[PDB]
Amino acid sequence: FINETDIGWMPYMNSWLERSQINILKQQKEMANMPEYPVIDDVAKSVFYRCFQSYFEQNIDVHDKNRVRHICPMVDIAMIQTICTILDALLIQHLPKLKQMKEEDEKQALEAFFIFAGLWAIGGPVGGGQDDSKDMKEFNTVWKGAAKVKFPEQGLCYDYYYDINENKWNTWKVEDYLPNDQPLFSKIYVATIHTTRLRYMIDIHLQRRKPILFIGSAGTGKTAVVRDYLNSTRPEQVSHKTINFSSFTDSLALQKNIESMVEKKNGRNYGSATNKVLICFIDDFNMPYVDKYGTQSPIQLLRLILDYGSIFNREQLEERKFLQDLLFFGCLNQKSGSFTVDLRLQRNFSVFSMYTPSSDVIKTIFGSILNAHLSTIDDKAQKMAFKLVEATYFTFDKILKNTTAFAPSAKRFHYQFNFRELARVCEGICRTTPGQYSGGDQGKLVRLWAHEMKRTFEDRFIANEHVEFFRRYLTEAISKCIGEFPETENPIAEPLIFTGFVAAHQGLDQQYTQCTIPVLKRVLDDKLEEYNEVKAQMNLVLFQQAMEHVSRICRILDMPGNNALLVGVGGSGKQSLCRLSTFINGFEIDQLVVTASFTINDLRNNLQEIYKKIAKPNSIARVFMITDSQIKEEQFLIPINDMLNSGWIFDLFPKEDMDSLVSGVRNEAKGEGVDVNNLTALTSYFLDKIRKNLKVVLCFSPVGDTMRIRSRKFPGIINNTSIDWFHPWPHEALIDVAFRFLEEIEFPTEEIRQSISLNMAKVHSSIDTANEKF
């Protein structure tokens, strides 16, 4: 048994300073793709030895658990390694400037270069808890115990990098969002202070071969920060491929993904020919199935690839097969799957907290999206942008702060409120076309808001207490932020329905304006007549609550990329209402037909039949209908979770079929005006077309925690899809539903037929009050 203090972390710090271990490995290995380290000059060595020893051995505050509240349980050496790799990357960038400077200003830089390297090494993984903002302001005061090179006040230590040419601590500068025409909202990326000072830290860990791990709440926007960086890499330096873990991603499945990525060098070695850097971005690092003992097989494989770099070939288990020039970019979220992964990996990674949405970060993203998108609609009704974004926060805050009402629990597993919702609120306001909104927007906007807010929070909620709590916050928000309180009549109301198909049907052009219930009653009833007449006949009533359901499913299909998730007790007619919603929009529903004897390979030919119809250019976007009964075993979901997470399920074709599917969409790309014979942007452009022309509507029931265990196993299901919950039919609805079926039965004075249909509702309402008593 080795004790931690016996060996220590000092030997690494001394060996890194002398360049003793590093020098030997570069000389005496096959690893010829080692990024050359900087020369630690006689002064530069002294200044780090003097500093490292003075901000670790000496500082008790730095190691005090209560002062420095980490997310993952960082080992001391893991922090020292991240300091060292950042110091490496700082020196190489600023080495010829340092050697031109004099003794005093060179020393004060090398000191500052440490303070900044340390700031991220220690303060980076600081985060988690309830208030991330306070665990930051607790650290912000300890690392503002920083010896000779004092910080500027009025800012956290994070918001400052040391500029060599001013020698000041300038604050990170953020590139103001320019409006692009990306139809998928997932492609939109507004730079914030936090997203630039990570973009640097990713470039600092790609310049070195140091793998990075981001750890933050389910909907914090970690994937987006990396999925921006990988997109902005050069296609000759870096080759990027995502591996989205599914719980069932075994050590075999990872090896197939890694073997597909990596080519065959000379001998038993496997890297990229032309010494490229092969990024294997793991998302949902925690998710892999935790066996009885507490050891995730795919994770243990990676710890065989990082350390010795030798994956045993699963066919022919004698061949060593050495892997070369790989990096791994993790995106672990705490509070999902295996909360933490084995510290024996997290060591090898540099950990970087991604903080829960701040009042500023929300105002700089969604402020920048609307101000941009209302510069379009009208010159007036901009000043409403910040007013609505102030509100959509205010309401969003008064939900997170009341944890006893709205907190992620075993029964409230889908109550996860993070950027995802503010994105598809700011998406639903981005649908306002200039003609049908321009003019006095004092009232019309704030409704469209109220609605878009309402139908990405109410939808979510189970208990009617939570629906009431929300509408109080929402009519506080409108009294402060939007501050008009226009009349005695609130912009928020019961019959607030906004729909983009009601305008289409009449013959109006791409509106997303509110109809009234009696206008929605004519259009839907006319469109149900049109679905009975052409497809297989489905008779349903269309009562106000089912009317609303088509309204708010046609909305979730219209939003490109956004996949629907209709949760409700089996018999609710979620399946029947979706088939209608689909036919209302110009889409064509594709449901798989399960026999008693069904295999994963036959599903993977039904899915592959659908992916031959989407991939042709002039394509009517096919919907994909799944239910609780259709998923016979938990394996079938694995393909489906990869479809709804992003684009198309990795390895549903040969790489010869996909070289022909890409080729059929080269005649469309020239027409769009997108670059052709790049084969990086064309593959990317096709994935955007497949993501856009595939909607994935899954239809579950919340009973016996069969949905909860699915949500646990597949991250995709709950976070990536816009949930809409199917409540039991109101009293007003039942009387209608009964009366439609009592039609074509005789009754003496017809007064009876209404009257029966009252007692047919009452009985069914009077069982539910006895069922609760029981």
Ligand X SMILES: Nc1ncnc2c1ncn2[C@@H]1O[C@H](COP(=O)(O)OP(=O)(O)O)[C@@H](O)[C@H]1O
- We find the least distance from the C-beta atom of residue 275 to other proteins, in angstroms, to be 6
Taking CB under 5 A as the rule, does residue 368 contact Mg ion?
no
- The region of 21-29, 43-51, 107-115, 217-225 touching ligand X under the rule CB under 6 A is 217-225
Is residue 290 helix, strand or coil? coil
Tell me, what DSSP letter sits at residue 177? Answer: P
Please report, as residue ranges, which positions from 680 to 699 form the binding site for Mg ion (by CB under 5 A): 699
- We find the least distance from the C-beta atom of residue 32 to other proteins, in angstroms, to be 12
Taking CB under 6 A as the rule, does residue 80 contact ligand X?
no
- The region of 94-102, 294-302, 502-510, 539-547 touching ligand X under the rule CB under 6 A is 539-547
- We find the least distance from the C-beta atom of residue 223 to Mg ion, in angstroms, to be 3
Beta bridge partners of 564: 722
Q: What are the DSSP E strand ranges found in 190-237?
A: 212-215
Tell me if 93 sits within 8 A of 317, measured CB to CB.
no
> At which residue do the structure tokens 């993977």 appear?
604
Q: Considering the complex, state which of residue 149 and residue 524 has its C-beta at the smaller distance from ligand X.
A: 524
- The region of 59-67, 165-173, 187-195, 252-260 touching ligand X under the rule CB under 6 A is 187-195
Q: Which residue is nearest to Mg ion (CB)?
A: 223
Closest CA to 125 of 28, 6, 243, 213: 213
Contacted entry of Mg ion, other proteins, ligand X, none for residue 274, CB cut-off 5 to 8 Å set by kind: other proteins
- Alpha-carbon distance of 43 to 106, in angstroms, equals 9
Please report, as residue ranges, which positions from 401 to 430 form the binding site for ligand X (by CB under 6 A): 419-420, 423
Instruction: Give the type of residue at 656.
Output: E
Beta bridge partners of 278: 239, 326
Q: Which residue is nearest to ligand X (CB)?
A: 573
Please report, as residue ranges, which positions from 601 to 630 form the binding site for ligand X (by CB under 6 A): 627
Given 573, 639, 647, 716, the residue binding ligand X (CB under 6 A): 573
Is residue 591 helix, strand or coil? strand
- Alpha-carbon distance of 116 to 162, in angstroms, equals 7
Count residues binding Mg ion (CB under 5 A).
Answer: 4
Taking CB under 6 A as the rule, does residue 571 contact ligand X?
yes
Closest CA to 45 of 26, 24, 20: 20
Binding site residues, other proteins, CB under 8 A:
236, 273-275, 666, 676-679, 682
Tell me if 205 sits within 8 A of 214, measured CB to CB.
no
Taking CB under 6 A as the rule, does residue 195 contact ligand X?
yes
Taking CB under 6 A as the rule, does residue 221 contact ligand X?
yes
Tell me if 174 sits within 8 A of 364, measured CB to CB.
yes
- We find the least distance from the C-beta atom of residue 527 to ligand X, in angstroms, to be 15
Please report, as residue ranges, which positions from 625 to 684 form the binding site for Mg ion (by CB under 5 A): 627
Closest CA to 425 of 405, 401, 398, 395: 395
- Alpha-carbon distance of 99 to 19, in angstroms, equals 19
From residue 279, how far is each of 209, 326, 646, 674 by CA, in Å? 10, 6, 18, 25
Is residue 726 helix, strand or coil? strand
Neighbours of 324 (CB within 10 A): 17
Contacted entry of ligand X, other proteins, Mg ion, none for residue 676, CB cut-off 5 to 8 Å set by kind: other proteins
Residue 724 burial (C-beta neighbours within 10 Å; 0-12, 13-18, 19+): buried
- 722's enclosing H/E stretch is strand 721-726
Contacted entry of other proteins, ligand X, Mg ion, none for residue 572, CB cut-off 5 to 8 Å set by kind: ligand X
- We find the least distance from the C-beta atom of residue 460 to ligand X, in angstroms, to be 15
Given 140, 242, 334, 575, the residue binding ligand X (CB under 6 A): 575
- We find the least distance from the C-beta atom of residue 609 to other proteins, in angstroms, to be 25
Given 59, 82, 223, 246, the residue binding ligand X (CB under 6 A): 223
Q: Considering the complex, state which of residue 157 and residue 423 has its C-beta at the smaller distance from ligand X.
A: 423
Q: Considering the complex, state which of residue 585 and residue 722 has its C-beta at the smaller distance from ligand X.
A: 722
- Alpha-carbon distance of 232 to 226, in angstroms, equals 10
Q: Considering the complex, state which of residue 374 and residue 546 has its C-beta at the smaller distance from ligand X.
A: 546
Q: Considering the complex, state which of residue 468 and residue 526 has its C-beta at the smaller distance from ligand X.
A: 526
Tell me if 243 sits within 8 A of 280, measured CB to CB.
yes
Please report, as residue ranges, which positions from 555 to 584 form the binding site for Mg ion (by CB under 5 A): 575
Q: Token pair of 654, please?
A: 């040969």
Tell me if 560 sits within 8 A of 183, measured CB to CB.
yes
Please report, as residue ranges, which positions from 237 to 276 form the binding site for ligand X (by CB under 6 A): none
Taking CB under 6 A as the rule, does residue 737 contact ligand X?
yes
Residues found near ligand X in the complex (CB under 6 A): 186, 188-190, 192, 195, 218-224, 333, 365, 419-420, 423, 540-541, 543, 546, 570-576, 627, 699, 719, 737
